[PDB]
Amino acid sequence: SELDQLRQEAEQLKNQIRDARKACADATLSQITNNIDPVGRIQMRTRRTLRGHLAKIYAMHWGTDSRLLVSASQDGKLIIWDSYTTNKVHAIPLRSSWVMTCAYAPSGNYVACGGLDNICSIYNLKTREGNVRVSRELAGHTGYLSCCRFLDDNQIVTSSGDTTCALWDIETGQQTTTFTGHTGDVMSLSLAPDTRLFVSGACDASAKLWDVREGMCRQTFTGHESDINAICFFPNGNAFATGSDDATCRLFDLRADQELMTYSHDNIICGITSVSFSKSGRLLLAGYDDFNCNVWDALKADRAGVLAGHDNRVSCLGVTDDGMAVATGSWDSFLKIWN
Amino acid sequence: VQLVESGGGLVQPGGSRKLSCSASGFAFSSFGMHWVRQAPEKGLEWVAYISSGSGTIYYADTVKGRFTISRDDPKNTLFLQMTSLRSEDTAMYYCVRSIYYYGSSPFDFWGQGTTLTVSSSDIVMTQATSSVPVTPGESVSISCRSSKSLLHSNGNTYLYWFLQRPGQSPQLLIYRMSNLASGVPDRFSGSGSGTAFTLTISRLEAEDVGVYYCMQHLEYPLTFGAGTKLEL
Amino acid sequence: CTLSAEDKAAVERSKMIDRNLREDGEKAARLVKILLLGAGESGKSTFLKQMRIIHKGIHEYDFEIKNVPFKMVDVGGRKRWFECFDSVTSILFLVSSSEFDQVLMEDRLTNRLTESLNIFETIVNNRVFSNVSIILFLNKTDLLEEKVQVVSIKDYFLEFEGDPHCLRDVQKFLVECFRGKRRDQQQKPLYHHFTTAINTENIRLVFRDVKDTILHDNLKQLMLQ
Amino acid sequence: TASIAQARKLVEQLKMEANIDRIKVSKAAADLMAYCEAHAKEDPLLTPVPASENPFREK
Amino acid sequence: NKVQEHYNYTKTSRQVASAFIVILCCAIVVENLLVLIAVARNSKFHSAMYLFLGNLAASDLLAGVAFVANTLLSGSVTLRLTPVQWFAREGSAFITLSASVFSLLAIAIERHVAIAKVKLYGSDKSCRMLLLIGASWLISLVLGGLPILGWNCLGHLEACSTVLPLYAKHYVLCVVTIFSIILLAIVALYVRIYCVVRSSQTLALLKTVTIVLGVFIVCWLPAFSILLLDYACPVHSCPILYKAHYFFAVSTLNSLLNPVIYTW
Ligand SMILES: CCCCCCCCCCCCC/C=C/[C@@H](O)[C@@H](N)COP(=O)(O)O
């Protein structure tokens, strides 16, 4: 026939890919970082507890001034905290209480939001009327909206559970670029620090690296065995870390095109909900289903602490832009700020 | 955004009045409101402040007990009940909105004011001069010296700068000594630290002539300055 | 108090935000959500439109019954986003009863009944749904009584039913074949029902079942069990 | 018929993804080590700063 | 130096049996300490009824120790006490049982109110619960300080009492009336709760749990009986009240069984 010939061509291309990836794996990250001294043990104590949510917290994001937060929850609200003094700046009532993502613009003006309603709401905080109006409602996806990350004050890239990502134009409202190629849902997104590339982790046991200027998939990374609930770049944009559901984080590398490490412990049997590196890249925090985060040494896999202060599953967390804090958020409607 | 006031006119001494302030165009329910008087030729002077709900209320030490500020949220109005009108109360009265959170710009929008004529601890802030001659195209400077150190322990000085054009209502120009207000062209800069503050202007225009006032916001009563006149 | 004027005013604004949050969380603590997930081919539209005339994204229908507010979250019908539909009291299933002898369109081999029962298995046997009290309607009972006195059923399924020419026999057979799918289902009973040609008793029955569920759940926080 | 478009686009995407020059794992490992060791002082979580510069516990 | 002759006016094998009730109150206080620390450590994982439970425990905690401070002071070597300090002893014995009975009534009130509504009861703080606990402790304060306040029997020696010899036969009427009212309210609330659950799989066990008003009735019945018989009998008439404190020992046996029933 003809379809089987193209399938054989695809199979031999995948074999060429596997041989090219195997030809470069001369050493590992363990056989090289086995001489530097470990980090020791890292005690982190809760510094603040931010109360006021009345339901499960599903996402959060840090401002780029390292002080202001934002937190979405199934209460139906979107609160903007002041993390230094624990008081609330704004509280935004959502039109649909089924919210599963959150963002915070890199300039501080706007705030994005999204959920099961298939739309991405852009809110304008610095109005001259003293309110927080819905500045835009971006529609055009066909499945639930899992993550959204601001790029400029005019462009936003987001990922939905209809096997697509999309780069929008907040002024007009139309999809500038659509990103296709996955097979299952898409539940995670992370932008490179230079904001020309980004990576997503699908419900397909795969991650992909797109470039927002062209609209094509550069590379794809396999190796997991379950969903990929989270993703995050390395602070220099040449590696990322996925957090799966089979109780294992990993560390891929965009130039070696392979997998480097495998952060997994035998006590751990529950899936990761959120990973986030540190400022220098020597830690890898990972919130788990068993109610507590971890702190993985990201050059030798040796676990180096535990942030156990929650009493329910910990949702997305985030390390500040200047480095001074971590901020987890869990299903008991409490944020915490470790340090 | 629009504030407009009513209730002025000639009053007999020892009487009573009520001033009204209607506010159309913004969210009045979440905006603290100040009254600010102004003598015929003697510059600004704080009068009273009422909070965003109906909580903290403050008065100047010369109008405490006589006056009474109040607000009505469903009608979007603000009232000042003045009792025992003395001869030193003839003035033009302005409303001022101000909202307080992290990173806000209080004293946003001044109203238009009513004229009210009748028949017949405390931070002290001084201005440099009373009138300077200038030319359009020259970079100028205005100095305002406090008496207590306005640099609070959290790092932000609380000195403001307003400008009043001839025949108009003053507008916010600079808040917290460095931050520029919205709609202000990139020619006004704020500097200094501690108890010596400075506003520097680049090449000026025909819309930069007026009187410049420096406020403080550490503690009530908020004490304005004497004003420096920018004449051509 | 070492706070400046703007700091104290910001704390006052925060306390007012907190008061408004507490009020909106009192208004939504006496709210009863009822998820609605049928089987597609089971006349969901007919029940929905009759409930709408008597009173892309996710849908939601607000109403009130006997001074209690109900939300009906009709999801537009997978793995990890049904974990937000916990703390949603009394999921409301819905099956067409007369669909025991037809066969699916895209699959001309398997029966529609076993497919609906497998959906029921995957939904009830979830772990997060171990605090929600499944209701179970069966529409088109008049279709069932029309198509039960003309055909037999022992030739369709191997499980023992008995005589094929009545109503109560096939009804108890259907309720047993649907109920038997659970696995150690305590603290969440299975209020089966039987909805004929459409009427007004449906929402009264749903209110009775949700009242029973909230009673059995208040009867454990009070330690009164 | 219909999936033949998926077949063409899949083999073309695989062709475009297979032709990229890679570097060794030793070089990328050394790059990651250099980044983790050159910025080890600017990390207030790896090495904790004293309680006079930490702005979350200074109340 | 006034109460000895007042005791001999209405006057060997008691200390050999009092150690049993002392170690009984020791078991009471250690059980209620375990219940109090279990409420303290498992408050963020449950409803607001825990706040009504530990309160009971807290009151019941005192129901141990105060009663201990009554037993070793049963001997006549200790009965040579200043009248105001004896009044304080009896008031301390009274207040921590009144607060226990009113905590029981507060729990019954909250159970009735929370089961009457059609909303899930899962909070941790409110206004009604502070009001009920405050009313409990305040009514126990007022009823325990009322003897010391001036209402006493010093001066009218002819008809004082037989077991509480400085209580003038009317405070006893008041406490028996209030206790009858509280018992009627508790049994009415729990009967109505059972009828309400009967209106709507566990009805065969709710009656088994609600027929454990039996422990309350058969454990508080000797105190009610002895007090009513004291008010009914005149002076030097009924000869059974000299062992009456033994009957009051049954009064703290309820404080033994509330931690084992309300946390099964
Ligand atoms: C609010 C409703 C009511 C609450 C409960 C009411 C129960 C009150 C019981 C009365 C308490 C009397 C205290 C007696 C203690 C004994 O140790 C001595 N009297 C006997 O010692 P002697 O002097 O004989 O050697």
Side-chain angles (χ1 to χ4, degrees), chain A residues 37-61:
Chain A
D37 289 330
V39 307
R41 164 78 197 250
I42 299 155
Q43 293 88 16
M44 285 196 201
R45 181 190 164 268
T46 289
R47 297 306 214 242
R48 321 260 162 204
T49 290
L50 311 156
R51 312 169 186 86
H53 275 295
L54 303 149
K56 298 177 176 65
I57 301 178
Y58 271 50
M60 45 80 69
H61 209 265

Coordinates of all heavy atoms in Angstrom, one line a residue, chain A residues 37-61:
Chain A
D37 N 30.6 19.3 46.5 CA 30.0 19.0 47.8 C 28.5 19.2 47.8 O 28.0 20.1 47.1 CB 30.7 19.9 48.9 CG 32.1 19.5 49.2 OD1 32.4 18.3 49.0 OD2 32.9 20.4 49.5
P38 N 27.7 18.4 48.5 CA 26.3 18.6 48.5 C 25.9 19.9 49.3 O 26.7 20.5 49.9 CB 25.8 17.3 49.3 CG 27.0 16.9 50.1 CD 28.2 17.2 49.2
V39 N 24.6 20.2 49.1 CA 24.1 21.4 49.7 C 23.8 21.3 51.2 O 23.7 22.3 51.9 CB 22.9 21.9 49.0 CG1 23.1 22.0 47.5 CG2 21.7 21.0 49.2
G40 N 23.7 20.0 51.7 CA 23.5 19.8 53.1 C 22.0 19.5 53.4 O 21.5 18.6 52.9
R41 N 21.4 20.3 54.3 CA 20.0 20.2 54.7 C 19.5 21.5 54.8 O 20.1 22.4 55.4 CB 19.9 19.4 56.0 CG 18.5 19.5 56.6 CD 17.5 18.6 55.9 NE 16.1 19.0 56.2 CZ 15.3 18.3 57.0 NH1 15.7 17.1 57.5 NH2 14.1 18.7 57.2
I42 N 18.3 21.8 54.2 CA 17.7 23.1 54.0 C 16.4 23.2 54.8 O 15.4 22.6 54.4 CB 17.5 23.4 52.5 CG1 18.8 23.4 51.8 CG2 16.8 24.8 52.4 CD1 18.6 23.1 50.3
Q43 N 16.5 23.8 56.0 CA 15.3 24.1 56.8 C 14.6 25.4 56.3 O 15.3 26.4 56.2 CB 15.6 24.2 58.3 CG 16.1 22.9 58.9 CD 17.6 22.7 58.9 OE1 18.3 23.7 58.5 NE2 18.0 21.5 59.2
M44 N 13.3 25.3 55.9 CA 12.6 26.4 55.5 C 11.3 26.5 56.4 O 10.5 25.6 56.5 CB 12.2 26.3 54.0 CG 13.3 26.6 53.1 SD 12.7 26.9 51.4 CE 14.1 26.6 50.4
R45 N 11.1 27.7 57.0 CA 10.0 27.9 57.9 C 9.0 28.8 57.3 O 9.4 29.8 56.6 CB 10.5 28.5 59.3 CG 9.4 28.7 60.3 CD 9.9 29.5 61.5 NE 8.7 30.0 62.2 CZ 8.2 31.2 62.0 NH1 8.7 32.0 61.1 NH2 7.1 31.6 62.8
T46 N 7.7 28.5 57.5 CA 6.6 29.4 57.1 C 6.8 30.8 57.7 O 7.0 31.0 58.9 CB 5.3 28.8 57.5 OG1 5.0 27.7 56.8 CG2 4.2 29.9 57.4
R47 N 6.8 31.8 56.8 CA 7.0 33.2 57.2 C 5.6 33.9 57.3 O 5.4 34.7 58.2 CB 7.9 34.0 56.3 CG 9.3 33.4 56.4 CD 9.9 33.4 57.8 NE 11.3 33.7 57.8 CZ 12.2 32.8 58.2 NH1 11.9 31.6 58.6 NH2 13.5 33.2 58.2
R48 N 4.8 33.7 56.3 CA 3.4 34.2 56.2 C 2.4 33.1 55.9 O 2.8 32.1 55.4 CB 3.3 35.3 55.2 CG 4.4 36.3 55.1 CD 4.2 37.6 55.8 NE 5.4 38.3 56.0 CZ 5.5 39.2 57.0 NH1 4.6 39.5 57.9 NH2 6.7 39.8 57.2
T49 N 1.2 33.3 56.4 CA 0.1 32.5 55.9 C -1.0 33.5 55.5 O -1.5 34.3 56.3 CB -0.4 31.6 57.1 OG1 0.6 30.6 57.3 CG2 -1.7 30.9 56.7
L50 N -1.4 33.3 54.2 CA -2.4 34.3 53.6 C -3.7 33.7 53.6 O -4.0 32.8 52.8 CB -1.9 34.7 52.2 CG -0.4 35.1 52.2 CD1 0.2 34.9 50.8 CD2 -0.2 36.5 52.6
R51 N -4.6 34.1 54.5 CA -5.9 33.6 54.7 C -7.0 34.5 54.0 O -6.8 35.7 53.9 CB -6.3 33.4 56.2 CG -5.2 32.7 57.0 CD -5.5 32.8 58.5 NE -4.4 32.3 59.3 CZ -3.3 33.0 59.6 NH1 -3.2 34.3 59.2 NH2 -2.3 32.4 60.3
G52 N -8.1 33.9 53.6 CA -9.1 34.6 53.0 C -9.8 33.9 51.8 O -10.9 34.3 51.4
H53 N -9.2 32.8 51.3 CA -9.9 32.0 50.3 C -10.8 31.0 51.0 O -10.5 30.6 52.2 CB -8.9 31.3 49.5 CG -8.4 32.1 48.3 ND1 -9.2 32.4 47.3 CD2 -7.2 32.5 48.0 CE1 -8.5 33.1 46.4 NE2 -7.3 33.2 46.8
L54 N -11.9 30.7 50.4 CA -12.9 29.8 51.0 C -13.1 28.5 50.2 O -14.1 27.9 50.4 CB -14.3 30.6 51.0 CG -14.2 31.9 51.8 CD1 -15.2 32.9 51.2 CD2 -14.5 31.7 53.3
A55 N -12.2 28.1 49.4 CA -12.3 26.9 48.6 C -10.9 26.5 48.1 O -9.9 27.1 48.5 CB -13.3 27.1 47.4
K56 N -10.8 25.5 47.3 CA -9.6 24.9 46.8 C -8.8 25.9 45.9 O -9.4 26.5 45.0 CB -9.8 23.6 46.1 CG -10.5 22.5 46.9 CD -10.8 21.3 46.1 CE -11.3 20.2 47.0 NZ -12.6 20.5 47.6
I57 N -7.6 26.2 46.2 CA -6.8 27.1 45.4 C -6.1 26.3 44.3 O -5.5 25.2 44.6 CB -5.7 27.8 46.3 CG1 -6.4 28.5 47.4 CG2 -4.8 28.7 45.5 CD1 -5.5 29.2 48.4
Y58 N -6.2 26.8 43.1 CA -5.8 26.0 41.9 C -4.5 26.6 41.2 O -3.9 25.9 40.5 CB -6.9 25.9 40.9 CG -7.7 24.7 41.1 CD1 -8.3 24.4 42.4 CD2 -8.0 23.8 40.1 CE1 -9.0 23.3 42.6 CE2 -8.7 22.6 40.3 CZ -9.2 22.4 41.6 OH -10.0 21.3 41.8
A59 N -4.2 27.9 41.4 CA -3.1 28.5 40.8 C -2.7 29.7 41.5 O -3.4 30.3 42.4 CB -3.3 28.8 39.3
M60 N -1.5 30.2 41.2 CA -1.0 31.5 41.7 C 0.2 32.0 40.8 O 0.7 31.2 40.0 CB -0.5 31.4 43.1 CG 0.3 30.3 43.5 SD 2.1 30.4 43.1 CE 2.6 31.7 44.2
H61 N 0.5 33.2 40.9 CA 1.6 33.8 40.1 C 2.2 35.0 40.9 O 1.5 35.7 41.6 CB 1.2 34.3 38.8 CG 2.2 34.2 37.7 ND1 3.0 35.3 37.4 CD2 2.7 33.2 36.9 CE1 3.9 34.9 36.4 NE2 3.7 33.7 36.2

